Amino acid sequence: IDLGRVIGELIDHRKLIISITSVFTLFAILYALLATPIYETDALIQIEQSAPETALLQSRMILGKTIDDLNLQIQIEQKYFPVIGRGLARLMGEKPGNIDITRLYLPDSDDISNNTPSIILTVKDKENYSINSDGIQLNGVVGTLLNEKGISLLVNEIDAKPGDQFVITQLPRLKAISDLLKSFSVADLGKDTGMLTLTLTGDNPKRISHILDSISQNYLAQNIAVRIIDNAVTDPNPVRPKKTIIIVIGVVLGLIVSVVLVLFQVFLRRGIESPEQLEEIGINVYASIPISEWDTLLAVGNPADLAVEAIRGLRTSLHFAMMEAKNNVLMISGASPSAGMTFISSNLAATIAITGKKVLFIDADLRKGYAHKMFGHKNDKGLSEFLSGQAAAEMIIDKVEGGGFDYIGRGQIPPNPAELLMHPRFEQLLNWASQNYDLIIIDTPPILAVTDAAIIGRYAGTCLLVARFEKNTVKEIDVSMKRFEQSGVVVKGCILNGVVKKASSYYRYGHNHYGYSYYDKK
Amino acid sequence: IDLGRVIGELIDHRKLIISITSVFTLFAILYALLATPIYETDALIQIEQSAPETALLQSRMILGKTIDDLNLQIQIEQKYFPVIGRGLARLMGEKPGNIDITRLYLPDSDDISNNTPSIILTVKDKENYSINSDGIQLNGVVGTLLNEKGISLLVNEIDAKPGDQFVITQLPRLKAISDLLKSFSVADLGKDTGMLTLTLTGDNPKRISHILDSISQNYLAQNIAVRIIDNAVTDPNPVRPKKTIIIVIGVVLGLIVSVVLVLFQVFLRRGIESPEQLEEIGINVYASIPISEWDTLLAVGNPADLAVEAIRGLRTSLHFAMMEAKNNVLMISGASPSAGMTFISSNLAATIAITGKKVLFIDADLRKGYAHKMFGHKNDKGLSEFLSGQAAAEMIIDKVEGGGFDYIGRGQIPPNPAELLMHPRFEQLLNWASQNYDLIIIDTPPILAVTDAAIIGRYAGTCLLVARFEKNTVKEIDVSMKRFEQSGVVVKGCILNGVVKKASSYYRYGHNHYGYSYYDKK
Amino acid sequence: IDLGRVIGELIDHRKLIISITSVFTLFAILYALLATPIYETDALIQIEQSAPETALLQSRMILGKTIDDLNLQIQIEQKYFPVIGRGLARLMGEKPGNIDITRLYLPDSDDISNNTPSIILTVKDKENYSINSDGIQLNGVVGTLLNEKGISLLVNEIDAKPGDQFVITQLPRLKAISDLLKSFSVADLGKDTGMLTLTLTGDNPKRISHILDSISQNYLAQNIAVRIIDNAVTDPNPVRPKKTIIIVIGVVLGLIVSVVLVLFQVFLRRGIESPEQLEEIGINVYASIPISEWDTLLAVGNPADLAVEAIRGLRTSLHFAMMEAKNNVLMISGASPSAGMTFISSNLAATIAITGKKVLFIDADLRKGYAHKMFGHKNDKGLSEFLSGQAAAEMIIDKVEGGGFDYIGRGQIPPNPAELLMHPRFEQLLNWASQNYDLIIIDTPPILAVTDAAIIGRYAGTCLLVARFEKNTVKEIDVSMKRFEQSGVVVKGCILNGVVKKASSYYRYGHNHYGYSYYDKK
Ligand SMILES: Nc1ncnc2c1ncn2[C@@H]1O[C@H](COP(=O)(O)OP(=O)(O)O)[C@@H](O)[C@H]1O
Ligand SMILES: Nc1ncnc2c1ncn2[C@@H]1O[C@H](COP(=O)(O)OP(=O)(O)O)[C@@H](O)[C@H]1O
Ligand SMILES: Nc1ncnc2c1ncn2[C@@H]1O[C@H](COP(=O)(O)OP(=O)(O)O)[C@@H](O)[C@H]1O
Ligand SMILES: [Mg+2]
Ligand SMILES: [Mg+2]
Ligand SMILES: [Mg+2]
Questions:
Q1: What CATH number did the domain enclosing A456 receive?
Q2: Helix, strand, coil: what percent of chain A each, to 5?
Q3: Interface of B with C in 350-369 (CB under 8 A)
């Protein structure tokens, strides 16, 4: 592999790369926009050391005093049903509702796990509200305290709109301290000075400055039984999420994932990429048929199609290869099913019919042949009924309507297709048809599926394999040609079918083998 | 690759390199000239330690006192509509207008995001002015304070010209402190001495020295309840942008981008670079035709053209290659469209006509042939009308006016061009024309587009391919020659068309294959 | 490449190397002699620490006091129109004029950029002088102060010669301080001692010691409200420019530039260097003709020339190669123009004429042939007039005066030279001339220019190519020989022309192929 190879692979997989990268960037952007902004407040403390003062600031004695002063054990969260409802509500300009609770005593279930009892407060208006802990509905009003059902709650100054819910948790005093201690940090900022930089983070920019002021004043009033230089103010710019590093990592992570997936698909693919791969093995490729993006015969529906043009090139290559053949019978087979044997043989039969030749197309796929459906059919009396003796050769030949050639359909699907083709009647039909037609094209099942074509190929002067572009492997076509040779069938060459335009072929080989459009646009 | 290869590539891509480099240097120069110059003022403080004094200088207590003294929360910016209007106005010698505001109270919208209310002051004259916050126009005069619409503003000493606008922002006190703290730095300069070096940066050289003097005097007056050695003066030479490092990086970055683009285009190109590439494969190249920089026949319009000289060299190479041929019919085809098959075949036909030979040019491109337009046409009765039987051979032959040879045009575009050429009439026309002409040149469509030339090439004694210089690949011409051989058409050789002078060919190979001019200048 | 190869290349490019090196050394010497000598004065200060004393010495308070005492804001520079006039005036022994100004007040334009107003003082005599700021001429006298036009100036003791000009700048007080601070340094020299080493640099050796004395005394008088051990004295030997390191770098930089240029020219050259390169390809080289440093025939003007001796060696090699040829016609062509085809063919014709043979020289370069000018001409009735039928073969043959052979000139330049040569008259002329002459030498245009020689070479029994020594490439001659072979012309071999003596050929190959002089000196 070299620069051109990898660049051609990147150009070919550009939809995959762009889609995976854009999905990663979309997820990164949705996280950067929906993650809750976390602010930071800081204060400056003057110490007259400061290493023992750091551990006393972060102690449950000092921090516990702040929890008691500000009631930090009353956790109130706006109710949002999804994990993103909070972020998007912030984007819609909705100001988050906040309710001020000064007294809260829950019944304190204190069961095996839920040591944090919780209720749900649904705002009804500016004055009154509702409560439902476990379905028990209780109406409350701002002002008048509530002492019912073993639930004490005092809600002051509901600042929200009606209909909003709030989860009100009464978390234990240590849990309130541990939460504060996790977001609260102390530093020295000079490592020698009597300066302490207390920082505190949180989602509420006003609350965290009230907490850091409480921590400073409590540590101040406790120390005298020290100077507060800068009282706590909140930096209005959130510190998290850092949107730029998140989106940048989303782009970069999306690219390296796109690149390793493309790198895997390139090192794992085994199918044919160009006719050169088949010709390295000594297999003559007589045509490379592109995918026609356009029960119809393509050579009849769209004669100017790029695949019909490639099949005309096969018609002229075959006129030169089928000379010096024993008979005018051409068998078209392949390795795998749905490689294009019926597409190619029937469209080849149509392009040889317009040149004024008498062509017979035999649907010798007694298993899955559908050519009668593709040509318009009097389905009775096909090749099955003839081979089993219950039809004459004249009653099975039928004309393709928009075609120009006759065809024999497969008939009713026999139970013994490979043994019907071994009948001496099949060689009699070909010996008869080889006198009334200039060319007989026999469509057969694939050889790596069944053995029918090795039986039929005994009576064909020319046999061509159809290789599917990315679906077949070089070894698959080489195994197919040698299974024919082992049964006495000489394969003249191959027809590469289903080629698509690929920049990697243009860089790996000099040619993409696709073909040019050549028409006067009018 | 070696030194000569890379140097030839650099010489060939010199326009690309020079343009990309000059674009990068132009952008670097425009940034270095339009970026606002940022100055630096410094002061020297004597401390009787200095590590705790550094953190007290950068504290919101000291810095907040300077914001209050100098009203640094009143942000005034000259109004410039583009992101470069400020820089270019400085280059035009325009002195920036400044207005002195001593009292500012905005209505303090304080909405979800815009915590910084703003108004726009449009100077009317030296004395009075206008104000428009959200369209509300208010007229104000220097001196008399304004208390209207909840907007307090006192503008003193408007120093500007009429028509100038100014954005007047009332940013919060912490935002004014954070802005000052970002540009204000303290150092010790001895790490032991009682010397503090206070530096401050900003776009206004006079203002930043007034701020650094305020910071020093406030920190001085606060410390007594210390010596100021050097009061703040501004270095008149801006510290940013550093123009030399910016332009130098612009040149260097522009070169390495130009070099990687050239390095990519060289490793990615696959087209033919010299006839040697075709002859490594065993393809005879009979001529290398340069691009003629000069509906005309080049061999008639400019007989002395360098491409007509190269085509004469082909005329003499063909006189030697077309001997021992079955007939006097020469087919000219190629791999891709617009490779020069019509240019070469028609100009070859013109250079063989001046030598006194009877030449017939057949436009056998029944799809996109335009030779009738290039020769002057009685468009009726071309090769289509003849092949379909509705025209006699005598009615289709026409004379090129300034030519010297006859031609058969393509006729009306048939619906079945490849099947018309298979008619036995085509071989009858050639067998007839091969008796009335010394040479028949057949122009055909490209073989990797359609199969027409493989049909026509059966009746031509000589077949030449035209390869386009950089557009075709060696593999494309090798695939073309083998598609002819598979249909029984022997390609004598190739004609490299469209060669351009390239220094890389002169270093990679010994020869650029372009050709010399040889005329007496008069 | 090995030692001999690189040494031969260095010997061959010795003029380039010596010139580039000498240019670099000349520039280095001119800089070392014309750069202004910058002196250094130093003082020793005793401190009773010294780290805070260093920053107080370099402060705008101490340094500003020295600027005020010595009026260092009055910048006076001798006026020299070029950027080197000052340096060369020092070399001519001219003592620099100096004027003592004690009072200077300029009108202080203080515009957008020029904050440093300037005037130009032109000395008229020892007593009076002139002033011109912006064309305003003012006459002043030493002693009497000048207060006119808003310009205060007091010039004392003009020490210069009449006619000298001086630029007198009044730079701002900070600019005077910043200039002093840039050249003034303080060190400790023991890192513990109370010793300070004040150094100061400048172009004036007396002034910088007066400044460093002022800085010491000001810092002394300020410190008491410390000992000066060594008062400032100037080292009379300038510290800059360091001439030896500059000239040495000039030599070394000049050599490495000379070496990389030679290294590039060697790796980039593609032309022929020795006949061995042509014989590696299988091309017979029949002679190597040196450049004759001597409208004349060299073989006639200077028969003893080294190139005529090499052409005699070709005459004897051709007598052996032209046997077994179909006719006595020798065609001389080449790849490129001005390779020496006319020089060689005409001088070969002259050296074969002195051997008593009848030689015909045909100037078959109908495009740019000048042989008639080189032989003395009756220009009418050349080969053009004959080929076009308007002249008989007898009327076109003419005798070379100092030659000994006949010649046919090209005639009037035809519009169709390549088509005139295809006339059957050309072969009739050669068949006629081949009976009346022992040898016919045909001079032709170059084959990579036009196709004329491939037409002419059909009727020549022997064809030789002339290769130019450094101008042609091996591939160019190989492409030329194969373009002849493709047109049925067999090239017997090549003639290497224009060889020059090169030491690189003697080391790369064993031989330089130049030839020896062999004559008896009298
Ligand atoms: N080059 C092609 N372009 C467009 N469609 C194609 C091409 N080759 C095959 N197909 C389509 O793919 C399908 C499977 O191909 P088919 O010929 O029926 O397979 P099989 O080899 O088993 O006979 C068909 O519907 C066929 O029309
Ligand atoms: N060597 C050339 N110099 C200048 N123009 C050229 C040269 N070769 C082709 N062209 C021009 O490029 C265009 C396409 O070439 P053309 O001969 O018409 O293509 P095609 O191979 O399909 O017949 C034409 O207009 C032709 O005149
Ligand atoms: N070996 C040589 N020594 C000196 N001069 C030479 C030599 N070869 C060529 N020249 C001169 O260089 C010039 C060009 O050579 P010329 O023979 O006229 O070129 P051309 O190959 O086109 O006929 C002539 O003036 C010729 O005299
Ligand atoms: Mg099928
Ligand atoms: Mg064409
Ligand atoms: Mg010449």
A1: 3.40.50.300
A2: 40, 25, 35
A3: 354-355
Sort C114 into a burial class: Cβ within 10 Å, 0-12 / 13-18 / 19+: exposed
Give the residue from B361, B460, B451, B371 showing the smallest Cα distance to B411. Answer: B371
Amino acid at B1: I
Q: Is the CB of C498 under 6 A from ligand 3?
A: yes
The pair of structure tokens assigned to A502 is 């690929």
Annotated binding-site residues of C for ADP read: 290, 292, 338-340, 342-343, 370, 468, 497
Partners of B123 in the β-ladder: B129
Supply the range of the domain harboring residue C408: 275-508
B348: tokens are: 């070859």
Structure token digits, residue A370: 């559908």
Three-state helix/strand/coil letters over A57-99? HCCHHHHHHHHHHHCCCEEEEECCCCCCHHHHHHHCCCCCCEE
* Pairing mode, strands B128-132 and B184-187: unpaired
Note whether C367 and B520 are within 8 A (CB). yes
Beta-carbon contacts of residue C504 (< 8 Å; ≥ 6 apart): C5, C8, C9, C11, C12, C273
Give the whole-angstrom CA distance, residue C127 versus residue C339.
Answer: 76
Q: Is A245 exposed, middle or buried (0-12, 13-18, 19+ CB in 10 A)?
A: exposed
Question: Which residue in B has a C-alpha nearest to residue C338's C-alpha?
Answer: B518
Is the Cβ of B46 closer than 8 Å to some Cβ of chain C? yes
**Contact in structure between A62 and A218 (CB atoms under 8 Å):** yes
Q: Are strands A329-334 and A462-468 parallel, antiparallel or unpaired?
A: parallel
Nearest-angstrom CA–CA distance, B56 and B220? 11
- Describe the crossing of helices A3-12 and A14-34 by its angle, rounded to 10 degrees: 70
- Give the pairing type, strands B285-290 and B74-78: unpaired
* Contact between chains at A312 and B55 (C-beta distance less than 8 A): no
CB A307 within 8 A of CB A501: no
Answer whether A236 sits within 8 Å of B413, measured CB to CB: no
Q: Is B292 in the pocket of ligand 2 (CB under 6 A)?
A: yes
Partners for B (CB, 8 Å, 3+ pairs)?
Answer: A, C
CA–CA gap between residue C465 and residue C443 (Å, rounded): 11
Tell the burial category of C491 from Cβ atoms under 10 Å away from its Cβ (0-12, 13-18, 19+).
buried
| Angstrom resolution of this structure | 2.6
Cα within 13 Å of Cα(C358), Cβ side = 9
Cβ pair B446, B336 in contact under 8 A: yes
Q: Residue C267: its chain B contacts at CB < 8 A? A: 2-4
- Whether the bond between A424 and the residue before it is cis, its omega within 30 degrees of 0, is no
Alpha-carbon dihedral C382, C385, C387, C391, rounded to 10 degrees: -90
Helix (H) or strand (E) holding B331: strand B329-334
- Three-state secondary structure call for residue A141: strand
CB C398 within 8 A of CB C380: no
The structure tokens listed for A323 are 């000379």
Residue C102 and residue C156 in contact, taking contact as beta carbons nearer than 8 Å: yes
CB of residue B340 inside a 6 A radius of ligand 2: yes
Interchain contact, B316 vs C450, CB within 8 Å: no
Is residue A145 less than 8 Å (CB to CB) from chain B?
A: no
Give the 3-state secondary structure of residue B343.
helix
- Tell me if there are at least 3 CB pairs under 8 Å linking chains A and C: no
Residues lining ion ligand 5 (Cβ < 5 A) are: B 341-342
